[PDB]
Amino acid sequence: TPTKMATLTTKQMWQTIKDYFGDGFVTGSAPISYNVHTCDMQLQPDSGIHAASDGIHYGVQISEDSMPLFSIMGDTAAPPCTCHRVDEIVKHIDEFLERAPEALPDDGAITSGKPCDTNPDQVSLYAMRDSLSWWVHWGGNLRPEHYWKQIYIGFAAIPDDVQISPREFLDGTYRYLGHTWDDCLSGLEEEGVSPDEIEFANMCMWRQMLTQWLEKADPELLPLLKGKISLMLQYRVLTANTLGCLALFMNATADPKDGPIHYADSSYEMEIASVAQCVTLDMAKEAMGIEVVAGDRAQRKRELRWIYVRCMQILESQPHAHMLRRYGSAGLHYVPMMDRYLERVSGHTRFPIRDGAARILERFINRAELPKESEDINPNG
Amino acid sequence: TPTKMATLTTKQMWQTIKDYFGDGFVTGSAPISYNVHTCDMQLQPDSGIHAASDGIHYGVQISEDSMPLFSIMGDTAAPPCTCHRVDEIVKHIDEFLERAPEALPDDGAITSGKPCDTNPDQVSLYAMRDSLSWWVHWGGNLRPEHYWKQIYIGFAAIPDDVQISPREFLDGTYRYLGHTWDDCLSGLEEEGVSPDEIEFANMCMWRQMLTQWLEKADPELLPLLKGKISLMLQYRVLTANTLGCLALFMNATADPKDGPIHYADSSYEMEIASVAQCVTLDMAKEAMGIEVVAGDRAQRKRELRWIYVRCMQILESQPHAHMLRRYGSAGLHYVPMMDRYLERVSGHTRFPIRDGAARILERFINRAELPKESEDINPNG
Ligand SMILES: [Zn+2]
Ligand SMILES: [Zn+2]
């Protein structure tokens, strides 16, 4: 077989994830392909009678009717549905990709929103601090056999704080703390993640990189989504890649006796949990007081709480409630505790990485592949 | 049987809870009678292999070794043990009670620490807001069949914000939102709580009222406890009455098929969970930045985290992990969300009770038994 090495174009990448994910519940939605329709979720009254094994005992349980007790919360409202317009968004993106540039002017710029940041590897180190912090609040440990799943979280987090081109992400030009993306894929193989699970997580990452890049490369896209609230939420969940991170978290945390994690068999519960965590994050950040948001911000908040309570209740009865309830609601404890968000409250500064944290993070840095400008990161590690 | 109506003296109350609780793990400790020795707890390494039914999946899971990732957390340190001095504390209290006054000068004064508070029934209303807020974050609902268990939480919370004499608490002179203590006991009977469970919760409340009153009535007591850290913690857990509140929460939340909640059969897990919640509260309040604390506050914090992680790990394997893990760690999400603590951050003000919260709280007020000065509380309810 002749050795071909051409990096796919963004158009070909888009086509590839279209073919892999297929359509969601709307025809022509690929690759925006969720099967759960958030707008149709129903909330059932709680009878108060629960078995010890009931899923309500996992995660954080805050009933809808109790939310008025908390001033930072309140009442809920069903969101308007524009989800059936998804085919129009995909058609628009197909057209844009016929003449899209492979590079943007600000590629490589820091976008963390914290003026202290001047080195992109230092930003990656902070993102790695955050990635282990999320992993822990989801229920995970720091054992060495999950090293590369944690690196995956880092790759999922850094595109928000550093502008990365999908091409450079794919072809090894971009490195996260010295790691190429292929290093993560190869590492997941060394850890024993099945090839099918790796490729699902891989395609989710492709989709994240593409959708986040389109938001910056195509000036028509965000205006097109901003006015379609329910659709913007679908899109934001893809740019957050909570689904890909969840798949690998489940692989690390699931009962060994249980079979491998297949999205084909568990898409419903995984999608519900991925949406719940995104909504919880936005809930918690707003409540604490730290543009994609459109229209009346007060109404958008009532919609998030509507979605949150229904996502969480549905997760009560799902086969993996024992992981997905906590994944869905973890923002309620990780946002108040994590430096990432406390730094923003404190005038968007940077907390020092003390020696204990630095020693934890040291092994995640491939110092041999860093640029000379970054050889001195994590010095106390 | 001749009708006798004399209110017990504080000495007789003390004797009664001594006879009821008996000794803890130290001889002569009654009624400071915990059987678990916090100082002896051991932390086991996590193998990372867990069944779906493992208790680690309940509550919030933050491993000890991950805590350095969070600037507001850090490392841990084992506390020094003075628990075997408990007999000296009880002996001292026995002597003080031989000539103790039945009334203190500031009895009836507001002690909430929020200058806005001028009416003790309004303070009780705010405490009721908080009581339902704690109940919800523990996992409970607002269903009417748990009304009087929630009133119990209110009685457990108000002694911190209003100075109450044990005599007036007992004999019906003190009313919480128009409810006497006997009204709560009778209400718990109407709700179907077994007599033995009610009397356990009752004795826990007696013990809370006595121990909190002794701290103010006996100027020698706090100096005696302050220097015995591990003992002060035992005492503070009794003044918080997390054990009594837990017993009734479990009654409301437990599997119906399971038997009644008997402290005689479940004291170990209940004590561990009661300690964990108190330690979590203090952890979370300090981390957020809101005197019993003695010596080097930095060291005391390392001790709290030591106790927290060991309490939580032990709860993984207990029969009621499916309730007690969340009870133990709930402070990690209820402290950031509850008005009680947000008010203190905001210059110890009072957030308005909006119409939604007021409508929730209305049924907990017995307006027929309020003093005329308080007839206008919760007007929007
Ligand atoms: Zn919709
Ligand atoms: Zn001890």
Swiss-Prot record, chains A, B:
Keywords in alphabetical order: Lyase, Magnesium
GO molecular function, one term: alpha-humulene synthase activity
EC number: 4.2.3.104
Expression induction: Expression is significantly up-regulated under xenovulene A producing condition.
Pathway given in the UniProt record: Secondary metabolite biosynthesis; terpenoid biosynthesis
Catalytic activity: (2E,6E)-farnesyl diphosphate = alpha-humulene + diphosphate
Listed cofactors: Mg(2+)
Enzyme class: lyase
Keyword Magnesium part of the UniProt annotation: yes
Source superkingdom: Eukaryota
One Gene Ontology term from the biological process aspect of the record: terpenoid biosynthetic process
Disulfide topology: none
Use in biotech settings: Xenovulene A is a natural product exhibiting little structural resemblance with classical benzodiazepines yet is able to displace high-affinity ligand binding to the benzodiazepine site of the gamma-aminobutyrate A (GABAA) receptor and could be potentially used as an anti-depressant with reduced addictive properties.
Function: Alpha-humulene synthase; part of the gene cluster that mediates the biosynthesis of xenovulene A, an unusual meroterpenoid that has potent inhibitory effects on the human gamma-aminobutyrate A (GABAA) benzodiazepine receptor. The first step of xenovulene A biosynthesis is the biosynthesis of 3-methylorcinaldehyde performed by the non-reducing polyketide synthase aspks1. The salicylate hydroxylase asL1 then catalyzes the oxidative dearomatization of 3-methylorcinaldehyde to yield a dearomatized hydroxycyclohexadione.
Family: Belongs to the terpene synthase family. Alpha-humulene synthase eupE subfamily.
Protein name: Alpha-humulene synthase asR6
Taxonomic classification: Eukaryota, Fungi, Dikarya, Ascomycota, Pezizomycotina
Gene this protein is translated from: asR6
